[PDB]
Design a protein around this motif. Sequence first.
Motif, PDB file in Angstrom:
ATOM      1  N   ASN A 430       0.883  -1.197   0.000  1.00  0.00           N
ATOM      2  CA  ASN A 430       0.000   0.000   0.000  1.00  0.00           C
ATOM      3  C   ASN A 430       0.911   1.235   0.000  1.00  0.00           C
ATOM      4  O   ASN A 430       1.386   1.602   1.100  1.00  0.00           O
ATOM      5  N   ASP A 431       1.165   1.826  -1.178  1.00  0.00           N
ATOM      6  CA  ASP A 431       2.298   2.773  -1.394  1.00  0.00           C
ATOM      7  C   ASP A 431       1.943   4.135  -0.808  1.00  0.00           C
ATOM      8  O   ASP A 431       1.024   4.785  -1.292  1.00  0.00           O
ATOM      9  N   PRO A 432       2.663   4.622   0.227  1.00  0.00           N
ATOM     10  CA  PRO A 432       2.511   6.003   0.692  1.00  0.00           C
ATOM     11  C   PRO A 432       3.247   7.053  -0.152  1.00  0.00           C
ATOM     12  O   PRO A 432       3.049   8.247   0.075  1.00  0.00           O
ATOM     13  N   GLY A 443      11.148   9.816  -1.250  1.00  0.00           N
ATOM     14  CA  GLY A 443       9.823   9.601  -1.859  1.00  0.00           C
ATOM     15  C   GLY A 443       9.855   9.527  -3.376  1.00  0.00           C
ATOM     16  O   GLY A 443      10.875   9.888  -3.996  1.00  0.00           O
ATOM     17  N   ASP A 444       8.727   9.102  -3.950  1.00  0.00           N
ATOM     18  CA  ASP A 444       8.495   9.001  -5.411  1.00  0.00           C
ATOM     19  C   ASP A 444       8.621  10.395  -6.022  1.00  0.00           C
ATOM     20  O   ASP A 444       8.523  11.385  -5.275  1.00  0.00           O
ATOM     21  N   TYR A 445       8.834  10.469  -7.331  1.00  0.00           N
ATOM     22  CA  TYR A 445       8.785  11.748  -8.078  1.00  0.00           C
ATOM     23  C   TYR A 445       7.378  12.341  -7.926  1.00  0.00           C
ATOM     24  O   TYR A 445       7.235  13.557  -7.654  1.00  0.00           O
ATOM     25  N   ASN A 453       0.757   9.030  -4.748  1.00  0.00           N
ATOM     26  CA  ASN A 453       1.038   7.622  -4.386  1.00  0.00           C
ATOM     27  C   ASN A 453       0.868   6.774  -5.640  1.00  0.00           C
ATOM     28  O   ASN A 453       0.396   7.284  -6.669  1.00  0.00           O
ATOM     29  N   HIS A 454       1.267   5.517  -5.541  1.00  0.00           N
ATOM     30  CA  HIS A 454       1.071   4.505  -6.604  1.00  0.00           C
ATOM     31  C   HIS A 454       0.002   3.532  -6.127  1.00  0.00           C
ATOM     32  O   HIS A 454      -0.101   2.442  -6.717  1.00  0.00           O
ATOM     33  N   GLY A 455      -0.747   3.921  -5.089  1.00  0.00           N
ATOM     34  CA  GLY A 455      -1.799   3.067  -4.519  1.00  0.00           C
ATOM     35  C   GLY A 455      -1.253   1.680  -4.261  1.00  0.00           C
ATOM     36  O   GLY A 455      -0.153   1.578  -3.683  1.00  0.00           O
ATOM     37  N   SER A 466       7.815   3.566 -11.927  1.00  0.00           N
ATOM     38  CA  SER A 466       9.062   3.920 -11.200  1.00  0.00           C
ATOM     39  C   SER A 466       8.711   4.288  -9.746  1.00  0.00           C
ATOM     40  O   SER A 466       8.753   5.477  -9.382  1.00  0.00           O
ATOM     41  N   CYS A 467       8.347   3.280  -8.955  1.00  0.00           N
ATOM     42  CA  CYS A 467       8.096   3.399  -7.501  1.00  0.00           C
ATOM     43  C   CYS A 467       9.434   3.266  -6.761  1.00  0.00           C
ATOM     44  O   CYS A 467       9.946   2.126  -6.654  1.00  0.00           O
ATOM     45  N   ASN A 468       9.974   4.394  -6.284  1.00  0.00           N
ATOM     46  CA  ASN A 468      11.206   4.457  -5.455  1.00  0.00           C
ATOM     47  C   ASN A 468      10.958   3.679  -4.160  1.00  0.00           C
ATOM     48  O   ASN A 468      11.870   2.933  -3.696  1.00  0.00           O
ATOM     49  N   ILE A 469       9.750   3.818  -3.614  1.00  0.00           N
ATOM     50  CA  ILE A 469       9.363   3.227  -2.299  1.00  0.00           C
ATOM     51  C   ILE A 469       9.442   1.704  -2.409  1.00  0.00           C
ATOM     52  O   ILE A 469      10.083   1.086  -1.536  1.00  0.00           O
ATOM     53  N   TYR A 470       8.817   1.135  -3.444  1.00  0.00           N
ATOM     54  CA  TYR A 470       8.827  -0.324  -3.724  1.00  0.00           C
ATOM     55  C   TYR A 470      10.270  -0.792  -3.904  1.00  0.00           C
ATOM     56  O   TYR A 470      10.627  -1.860  -3.381  1.00  0.00           O
TER      57      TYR A 470
HETATM   58 ZN   LIG Z   1       5.362   4.552  -5.545  1.00  0.00          ZN
END
Ligand SMILES: [Zn+2]
Length: 811
Positions: A430-432, A443-445, A453-455, A466-470
């Motif tokens: 669950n992407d914050p 954080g993401d761009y 978020n990327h949900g 491109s999810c940096n968090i993932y």
């Molecule tokens: Zn993301």
Amino acid sequence: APRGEIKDRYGRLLAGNKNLFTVQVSGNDINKKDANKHSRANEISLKLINLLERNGEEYVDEFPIYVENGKYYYTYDRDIREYKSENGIPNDYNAKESFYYLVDKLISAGILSQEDKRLDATRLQAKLNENGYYPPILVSKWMFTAERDKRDWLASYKLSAKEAFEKVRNSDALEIDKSLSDEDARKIMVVRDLIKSKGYSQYNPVTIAKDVGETTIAQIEESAMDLVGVSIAVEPVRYYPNGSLASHMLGYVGKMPSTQIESYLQKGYETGDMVGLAGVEKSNESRLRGTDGYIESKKPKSGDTVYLTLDKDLQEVSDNALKQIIEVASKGGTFKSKFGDKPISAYAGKAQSAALIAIDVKNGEVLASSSYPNYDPNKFAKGISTEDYLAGSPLLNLVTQGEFQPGSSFKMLTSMAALENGLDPNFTINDPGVIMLGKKSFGDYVWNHGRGNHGMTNLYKAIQESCNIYMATIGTGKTWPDGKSIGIDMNANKILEYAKLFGLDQNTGLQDEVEERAGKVPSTEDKLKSTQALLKSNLENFAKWSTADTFNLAIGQGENAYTPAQISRYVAAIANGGNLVELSVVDRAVSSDYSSVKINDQKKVEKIPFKNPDNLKELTKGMKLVARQGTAKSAFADFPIDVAAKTGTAEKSGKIPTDNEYEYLKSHMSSYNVNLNDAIKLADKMKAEKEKELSLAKEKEIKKKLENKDLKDEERKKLEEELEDGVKVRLEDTDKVNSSYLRKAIKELNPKITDDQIDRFKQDYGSFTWTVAFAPADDPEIAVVCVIPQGDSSVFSLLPTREVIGTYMGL
Ligand SMILES: [Zn+2]
């Protein structure tokens, strides 16, 4: 021996020989006779440079006082300031201070022994030039070659240029009207000083301009008896019909560099021979030079014709695609394409360079290789040494020599390593869009720009968007609110393990064909022995990769730095199903009897020892989504070919440090609301307080070493002698020392100013955009890699890639 032609893979000429009509001047024939008392030289010269300009000709000008915006500078001086800028040192007023601190920073990284650094210069200097690095300074006098050349060049008729341009203006040799425009006087000197220079004794007349058209020949021929001794001569040249097309790979010919004369004489050259100085002209010099001929005569064998692996057509589309994007980026407006057309948001100023390479993913053949800015090899054929005109040197091949944070394009590598250590692609977060471990944010761009978020995100969406968090999560094998382990064991060490497997730690194959400065996988063990060595000496966390280090790595930033050529092999390994391919720009040589050798015939195709090659199929699934509904949809969603892509924009946090930190602070001292005299005096006071304090501490040290009864009584004498005189410790007069103290004077005299506020006038590292692609994605032929440094938008790197893939695939 006519020099061997260079052709593209299909026979189109890239470098050949032709004849040129050229203007020549005679040292004496123009200088008439003193008996006439006509120094007509100033008249025929002024007419010649004005005849040329009016006819629109490029003319020779080695006269070392040039006009750049109302001011007069030395060329000798420019070479000094600008050479030092490309060898990372403060361009101040000492040649020794600049030699010893450069050598100190290359010896800092396994150049040689630290004790063979401090070794007699006659033995030292010779050996570091022997190693294969140029020697731009003089051993005995400790002066820049150019400095000597200046003293010598003025002693031929010691400060100032506008002065020197005045004194040389009316020196014995020249004698101008002293009633003419320094603009007209300067152009007279271009001619007179070339005659003086090209020999105290010269073979023949000197050449003043080279390629010149009919309407300029004629105006010279039917101007006989006016410009007495101005000839139209024929002389052959190297020529590159497509100009700056593939300049960096082609290289150029020139006079052998001064330093290597002995080599070239022993190797069998003459000092006036044109020789390869870069790219394939250098590496195939021997092959292109042929073998010379000579009662009886033997014909010369012409140079083997060298075929590159480039497609001139694809090279054209590549070269223009970068010229356009760079012109259109900075307040350009529109990118005109033959697929779509993008109206370009003109918020991208300061983007002044780009790099693209297309390679065949099965045999590593380089089909297109472009770097911007670039250069006309034709200018070097006729005679120059520097084009010029944080600045990017146009002679630098950013494809082979540009070490760059790989950015988003590293994500497939992090992902590969996760899968190889048990990641289930389906693993959903669950992407914050943000992680906090400092007060500092990762954080993401879409989170740095809209707190997006990327949900719900599995590996495919992570790649797609491109999810940096993932990437951080799988890179560590941990979710980051709590730091709980996921299924899998991952860390920087495993990330750099896969960096190494995809050949990022090694040269590409082009190193012996063209100039390359390959990147190096950041070393775990260098970072441990870096800090232990710095810890040993201090006794008289930063040792392992942190969680933040691991984060930055997992998203192709931090200490990651690789060339586009290196990345293309990485990408190609995904496309070709896991074979590391050795790139080549030189395909074939063809003898002057139509016999032919394949030169790239032994290029390596190593199978990468992956646990499960089928994991590259999970990345391709992710990379196709990038093209259809990911960060590359704007370019590739409505595109006739099925493309795997990865695209992104990245920010490099922080400020670019300056040439002179002490002088930066002196620049902006009013803007700090601080009096400059006050700041400098307080800075001195604090150095003095540190010098006095260190002295009294050095006494305590010497006395404690002296109380050591069992101590050899010839060092006891040294210590007593050091202390006898009284101890006066002085701070090293480094720019780092003087800067530290002026900065602490600033903060004292302005007690509210911060470090960011002091540093605010520095340029940010800024933003960059890679796109990487292969196509057609289900049976790949070509991989393309495009980097735009100082790039605001993914469009800048997306559109050049599309043009090249479209061209290659026949659209
Ligand atoms: Zn993301």
